[PDB]
Structure 1
Amino acid sequence: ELEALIAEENALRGGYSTPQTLANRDRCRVAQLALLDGPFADLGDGGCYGDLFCKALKTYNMLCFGIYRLRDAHLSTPSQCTKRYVITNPPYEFELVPTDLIFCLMQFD
C-alpha cells in the first residue's frame, strides 16, 4: 500500500490516526544495547551465550543477533582500541566479556 501510494504521489503525506493506524507501531525494533550495565548485566562473564539469549527470551522476548565485541577484547594485553567488530550467530558455548555491545531486537513499542 505504501509502494502504491508512492507510485501515485511521489511524496509521503500525513493522515489522521485511527486505532488501526496506531497498530502500525508494531515493528519489532532494531537496537544495540550494552552488556556492562543494565537489567541483563547480571551475567557479563559467563560463556553460556545460550543461557544469555534464553534469559533475553524469558525476560522480554529480546531476540539477540550477535556480539559486537571489541577487537582486542579477546586479548590479555590491554590496548586502547575501541574498534568493535561484529560476530554473527554466536554458538551456545561462546564466551562473554562485560565490555560488550549486543545486537538485539526487543518487541515493538
Structure 2
Amino acid sequence: TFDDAGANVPLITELANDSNVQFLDQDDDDDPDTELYMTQPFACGTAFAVSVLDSLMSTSYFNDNALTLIRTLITGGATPELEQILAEGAGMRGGYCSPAVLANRDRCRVAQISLFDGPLAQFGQGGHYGELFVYALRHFGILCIGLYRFRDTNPSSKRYVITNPPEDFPLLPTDQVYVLTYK
C-alpha cells in the first residue's frame, strides 16, 4: 500500500513454466489443463511465456514478409543493416545524423488511446466499433486493431484484449482501443 494502491500497479511477468500462470492472480477459477492463452492472466496481458512464440517457425515458413511485419513493430524498427553493424562487434555506433536518415523517424507505431474523452468519446458513449474504425481512419489516419476492455463493469482494474471486434460490436466509455498511428 502507498497511502503515505497495491494491485492497481501494472505488471508483466515472464514465466519459465506456463503452468505456473495459475498462481499469478485470485478468483481466476484455475484449471491445470487450459492452454496458457485461455488463462485470465494471459488474456489480461499480465503474463507472458516463450510457449506462445513457437508457431513463429511455421509463420516464418508460410509468409516470410509477415515475420518482418511483426518485427518492425516489436523491435521498434530494427533492420538487417543494424543487425549487421552489431555483428561487426564494434558495439552500437551512433552520433548526429543527416536529414535523409532522420526521415525514418516518421514511421508507424502501435499506440493505445481512450474513449473516455477527446474527439472519439462520442463512440464510447454507446456507439459501435465499426463507426469508430471508419471515423478514426478518415479524420486521423488512425487504424484501429482491437480493444482493451475492463473485465468487470460496475470494481477491479483488470482489462482484457479483444482483437479486431465485429463492426456492430457495442463500445463502452471506459474502453481503450489499440491503434496503428503515424504521429
Same fold (TM over 0.5): yes
Please say which structure displays the higher CA radius of gyration.
2
Query: Matched residue of 2:85: which SS?
Result: helix
2:71 counterpart of 1:71: no
* TM-superposition CA deviations, 1:55-87 (whole Å, max 9, x none): 0101111011111001113xxxx2x11100001
2:130 corresponds, among 50, 69, 90, to 50
Higher relative contact order (CA 8 A, sep 6+): 1
2:174 counterpart of 1:99: yes
Q: Could you say which structure has the higher strand fraction?
A: 1
Shift of 1:15: 2.7
> Number of matched residues?
103
Q: Identity of counterpart residues, as a percentage?
A: 55
TM-score of the pair, normalised by structure 2 = 0.53
* TM-superposition CA deviations, 1:22-62 (whole Å, max 9, x none): 11102201111111112211221334211111001011110
Would you identify which runs of 4 or more consecutive aligned residues in structure 1 move more than 2 Å? 45-48
> How far apart, in 1, do the equivalents of 2:92 and 2:137 lie?
36
Q: Could you say which structure has the higher helix fraction?
A: 2
> How far apart, in 2, do the equivalents of 1:98 and 1:27 lie?
29
Flag structure 2 segments of 5+ consecutive residues without an equivalent.
1-80
TM-score of the pair, normalised by structure 1 = 0.85
